[PDB]
Design a protein around this nucleic acid. Structure first.
Lengths: 32, 38, 51, 252, 98, 166, 273, 75, 47, 98
RNA sequence: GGAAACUCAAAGAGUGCUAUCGGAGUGCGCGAGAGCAUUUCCG
């Protein structure tokens, strides 16, 4: 079974997961 | 039954103290016994 | 990658010293200086009976 | 060569790390709002939450900051460390800080902007390592206590080395020392690269254009009777007169 | 290819503020604590020397004593600090030792 | 057997549970009677368990007059009825380290199951809590002690003199 | 240290938490180093209730994640092991330690009381009585304490003898607030209406007038008058005829302003004589 | 699982039998409760793995390991 | 300890905090007669 | 022992089990700590841990010869030392004849 | 010679800082548990 959505949101809280921050930064950073 | 559920109950503020909120922002930052120097 | 012990023990070795705890470790180890006779081939052998 | 030089290289390369408590308090008491005796007890969540309030006020007066509230002012950014990641990520976060600073260069008359940018001064150590974007992004407010605070916090990069007699001195630096800073052309090339990056991002505004114009006319006035220096100084001022004319605002 | 290297990260070891207490990270390995028996032996020898340094047993008299030497002493059993002394020329006394 | 202590203060009444005990036999020694002076060992010995402030100024004057003649009053009897447990007759009766033998019989008259005590142990324990003062109370108040005791002292003095204010 | 002792006491829950496969070693070392930093921040020199609050938030969220991975991986609710009650035991320890180290913040006291009222199904009302009695001891003056857990004792357990007991104890403790008297009259009328409705339910399936409320009204009137007079005239009984008479007129005005509020939120109540 | 690292290498009198049972039980309990500390050990060690057959572990030099290593360790 | 095997097996394990955990260390040290600090020790009378 | 006590006639433990009340024939009722090094103040928990730990170390290592010859010896007064020495040589002689 | 202390190091004093199986039931203890322990509702 896969990770649930709210379960992975709690995972990002509890484990201190900054991979979303790194992906968001390196993806978006250059704009407009 | 609707009389018992339209009766007023007691009035505390304790759970409001448990779950209030706040919003503020922080703004930035001889003696009596000595005699005068001549 | 594997050639360093990762998890030092702070009561003896410490890569984040200050002056205060450096002097404290100096005075504690000078107080617990093992005497020079106590180094055999096996340092578990100072508690036994004497043969 | 000199072992002292090869060690000062790694000293300036590892200034942004704390290896004992004295260096941690020396690297943490550098703050933009508070003084030493209060900023040396600030946990990161405190300045993060008041800076999130500051960013929200700045966002509801300026609509280009919700992207930063998503990315760089996030909740996990209080646990994101600077120098534990890889150099590609440090380059990406480097131009993220550059984008933030030249976006919020026009807002420094506001306590929300000050308390908002104090967070990444305190956490992302832009008072040490992303130093020159901070300096020549807030250079135009040189008669201001926020600039005196910036200059007292920061260490000076070698281009700005004629500001170094205004650290720990309560007089703000003068127009004449600003012109003596703009005089040498190897600062001037750097300032023009900043200026055309600001043009192509289209954030040019009527205060820093005024300051850049007054500094350029006084540099030309300083070299009024220096034919060689003017002959060397034409293809900088003229080239960015050109790529300033290629913009659209009447001010620039 | 997958590589990695340990990350000191300088925040979970040296603190963020000034006043909180720094970490004492801990590894209970007999590798990293080599001399067990000789070190606790020398701690025992320092214990014996310090016990001889603090061997100060006498705490006090009480009153100016009796007349001519005691010959009976009776502690009580309910309370702690009350103690009767009877001495030779028919003199009994009931001391509060506090 | 000293396990509850009563202290009276010019903002309110305090009652302290005695966590562990003082050394009774060696209670004239230097290394014991410096522990009362320093703070890091006194809070090992006494913790705050109740502090009810009388809030009326005139009720503070009235409590001070009733203590100064050695008599119980409403707020004191109220907090002792609240805090002091009914020690059942199988175990013991509870003990209470109060400051004076003039007050003693007037609480023994009202509460039977309490038992007041003031030897030198209660004397210097109350002396220690008087010395450390505000730092025991850990913030359960609004107002410092000295200005309140200045007002209460002037009022108690005028009520003793019955000074004509005309 | 003692931080080493608390961290070493929290090891068997992660032991069986990895022994059953719902947490692998990498992320359990992640949560253990996060709890290490949180616990040193808790047992620092000069910590804060904000630190206690966010450490409690971390433990509640790791409990929610443990329940979620238990209902996802093992597909059972209760693992009948050490892994279930351990986090709630730790949250109880943290709330007890916070109320010991910082007893003047009713926000934190109320968060402890709400958490324990929620977990009353697992740990019953004796812990509620214990922490509420020590709260009453450490804050006798603040009348909202008495009012709140009198509302608790009347609306969750409905034990009227103990409810009237703690109202009378609090009314003895501070008979100079209007709110406690007025809400005692409100509770007394709620009890008498529930008793008369019990009598009407007896008549449906086929003496005790409002003298309680009237006597406590009379004692309310004279006691609030006396203590309003003693709230004025601070230390010295003011002795001039017109001033004494005009302050008696002032306390008559304030006392009748209380009695009209009694008439108002009794007319809202009425259903009686 | 880890107790070999933490290991430290029939009688007549009844009280001595009980004392010997107490001391070797205390030995076993202290070795187990010392071996249960590496759950609380702060971080894990490092490794470079081959993860293939052609990717040998010694055809890796300072350029690629310094590229994919941390900035603090690279400095 | 009546012979060298029981004596070595006695002192085979150290007690300082550098070699054993915190809870096991605070269990391995406490006196056999842990006395109450400042009050009267009565003779036992249980059965 | 002390120079100013003669012929101790009555000794009693106190109920605190830490203080022995001795009463001489000179007239005084002296007091002594039983453990001649444990002080009586309430101590902090790390200090109590240190004291009980090194006391357990002394108890475990009491058979080593040099810490035995440090922990054993006192300043026994010269009367008691000489008379116990001649009593010991008398007992060895009578054991030899036995 | 005056010293900017903002380069750092070794040290000395004064000041402030912390504690030591789960709810009932069931044989149970004097409105009552602080515990002895389960196949009873169980979880």
């Amino acid at each position: 079974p896969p990770p649930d959505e709210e379960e992975q949101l709690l995972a990002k809280f509890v484990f201190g997961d900054t991979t979303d921050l790194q992906e968001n930064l390196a993806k978006f950073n250059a704009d407009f | 039954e609707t009389n018992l559920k339209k009766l007023p109950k007691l009035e505390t503020g304790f759970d409001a103290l448990a779950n209030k909120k706040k919003k503020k922002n922080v703004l930035p930052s001889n003696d009596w016994f000595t005699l005068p120097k001549p | 990658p594997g050639a360093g012990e990762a998890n030092y023990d702070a009561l003896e070795l410490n890569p984040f010293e200050t002056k205060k705890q450096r002097q404290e470790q100096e005075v504690r180890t000078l107080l617990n200086k093992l005497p020079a006779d106590t180094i055999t081939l096996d340092p578990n052998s100072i508690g036994s009976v004497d043969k | 060569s000199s072992l002292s030089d090869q060690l000062a290289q790694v000293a300036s390369n590892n200034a942004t790390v704390a290896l004992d408590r004295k260096r941690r308090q020396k690297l943490h008491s550098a703050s933009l709002i508070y003084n030493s005796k209060t900023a040396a007890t600030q946990d990161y969540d405190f300045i993060f939450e008041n800076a999130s309030k500051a960013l929200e006020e700045l966002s509801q007066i300026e609509p280009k900051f919700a992207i930063f509230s998503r990315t760089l002012f996030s909740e996990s950014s209080i646990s994101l460390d600077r120098n534990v990641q890889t150099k590609e990520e440090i380059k990406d976060l480097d131009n993220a800080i550059n984008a933030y600073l030249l976006l919020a260069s026009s807002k420094w008359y506001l306590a929300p902007t000050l308390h908002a940018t104090e967070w990444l001064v305190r956490r992302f150590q832009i008072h040490v390592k992303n130093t020159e974007m901070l300096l020549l992004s807030t250079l135009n407010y040189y008669q201001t206590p926020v600039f005196k605070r910036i200059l007292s916090i920061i260490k000076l990069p070698p281009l700005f080395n004629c500001l170094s007699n205004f650290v720990r001195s309560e007089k703000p630096p003068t127009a004449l020392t600003m012109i003596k800073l703009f005089n040498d052309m190897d600062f001037l090339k750097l300032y023009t690269s900043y200026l055309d990056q600001c043009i192509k991002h289209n954030a040019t505004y009527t205060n820093q254009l005024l300051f850049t114009t007054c500094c350029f006319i006084n540099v030309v006035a300083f070299n009024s009777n220096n034919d060689e220096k003017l002959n060397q100084l034409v293809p900088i001022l003229l080239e960015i007169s050109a790529k300033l004319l290629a913009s659209k605002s009447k001010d620039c | 290819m997958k590589i990695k290297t340990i990350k000191r990260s300088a925040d979970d070891y040296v603190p963020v503020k000034s006043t909180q207490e720094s970490q004492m990270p801990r590894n209970l390995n007999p590798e990293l604590h080599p001399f067990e028996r000789a070190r606790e032996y020398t701690k025992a020898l320092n214990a014996t020397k310090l016990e001889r340094m603090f061997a100060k047993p006498f705490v006090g008299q009480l009153g100016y004593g009796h007349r001519d030497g005691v010959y009976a002493i009776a502690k009580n059993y309910g309370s702690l600090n009350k103690l009767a002394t009877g001495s030779a020329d028919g003199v009994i006394k009931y001391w509060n030792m506090s | 057997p000293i396990e509850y202590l009563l202290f009276e203060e010019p903002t309110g009444y305090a009652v302290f549970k005695v966590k562990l005990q003082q050394d009774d036999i060696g209670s004239r020694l230097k290394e014991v009677q410096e522990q009362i002076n320093d703070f890091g060992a006194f809070t090992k010995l006494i913790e705050l368990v109740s502090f009810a402030p009388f809030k009326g100024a005139a009720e503070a004057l009235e409590n001070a007059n009733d203590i100064s003649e050695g008599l119980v009053s409403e707020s004191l009897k109220a907090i002792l009825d609240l805090n002091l447990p009914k020690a059942s007759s199988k175990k013991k009766n509870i003990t209470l380290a109060i400051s004076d033998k003039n007050l003693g019989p007037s609480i023994k008259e009202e509460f039977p199951y309490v038992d007041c005590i003031s030897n030198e142990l209660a004397q210097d324990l109350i002396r220690g809590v008087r010395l450390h003062g505000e730092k025991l109370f850990k913030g359960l108040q609004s107002g410092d002690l000295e200005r309140a005791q200045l007002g209460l002292g002037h009022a108690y003095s005028r009520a003793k003199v019955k000074f004509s204010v005309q | 240290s003692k931080t080493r002792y608390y961290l070493e006491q929290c090891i068997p829950e992660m032991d069986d938490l990895v022994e059953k496969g719902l947490f692998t070693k990498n992320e359990v070392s992640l949560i253990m180093k996060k709890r290490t930093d949180f616990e040193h921040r808790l047992n620092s020199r000069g910590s804060s209730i904000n630190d206690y609050i966010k450490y409690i938030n971390y433990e509640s969220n790791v409990n929610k994640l443990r329940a979620k991975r238990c209902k996802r991986i093992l597909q059972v609710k209760k693992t009948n092991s050490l892994s279930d009650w351990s986090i709630q035991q730790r949250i109880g320890f943290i709330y007890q330690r916070g109320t010991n180290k910082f007893p003047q913040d009713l926000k934190f006291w109320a968060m402890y009381l709400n958490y324990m009222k929620a977990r009353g199904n697992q740990t019953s009302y004796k812990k509620i009585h214990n922490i509420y009695n020590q709260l009453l001891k450490l804050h006798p003056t603040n009348v909202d304490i008495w009012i709140s857990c009198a509302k608790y004792e009347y609306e969750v357990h409905a034990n009227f003898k103990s409810c009237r007991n703690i109202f009378q104890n609090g009314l003895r403790f501070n008979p100079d607030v209007p709110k406690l008297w007025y809400e005692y009259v409100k509770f007394e009328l709620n009890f008498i209406t529930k008793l008369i409705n019990r009598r009407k339910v007896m008549g449906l399936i086929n003496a005790l007038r409002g003298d309680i409320a009237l006597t406590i009204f009379d004692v309310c009137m004279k006691t609030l008058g006396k203590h309003y007079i003693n709230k004025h005239k601070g230390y010295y009984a003011i002795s001039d005829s017109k001033m004494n008479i005009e302050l008696n007129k002032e306390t008559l005005n304030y006392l009748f302003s209380e009695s009209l509020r009694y008439i108002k939120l009794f007319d809202e109540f009425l259903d009686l004589e | 699982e880890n107790q070999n690292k933490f290991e430290r290498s029939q009688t007549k009198d009844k009280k001595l039998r009980a004392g010997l049972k107490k001391i070797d039980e205390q030995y076993k309990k202290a070795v187990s409760s010392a071996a249960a500390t590496d759950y609380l050990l702060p971080e894990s060690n490092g490794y470079l793995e081959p993860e293939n057959e052609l990717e040998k572990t010694f055809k890796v030099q300072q350029s690629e390991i310094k590229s994919s290593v941390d900035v603090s360790t690279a400095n | 300890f009546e012979n060298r095997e029981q004596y070595e097996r006695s002192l085979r394990m150290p007690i300082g905090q550098e070699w054993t955990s915190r809870a096991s260390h605070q269990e391995l040290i406490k006196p056999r007669i842990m006395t109450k600090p400042g009050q009267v020790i009565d003779p036992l009378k249980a059965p | 022992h002390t120079k100013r006590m003669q012929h101790v006639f009555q000794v009693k433990y106190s109920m605190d089990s830490k203080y022995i009340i001795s009463g001489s024939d000179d007239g005084n009722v002296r007091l002594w700590r039983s453990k001649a090094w444990e002080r009586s103040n309430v101590k902090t928990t790390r200090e109590k841990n240190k004291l009980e730990y090194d006391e357990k170390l002394k108890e475990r290592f009491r058979h080593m010869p040099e810490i035995k010859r440090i922990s054993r010896h006192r300043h026994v007064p010269q009367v008691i030392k000489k008379a116990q020495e001649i009593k010991n040589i008398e007992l060895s002689s009578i054991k030899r004849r036995e």
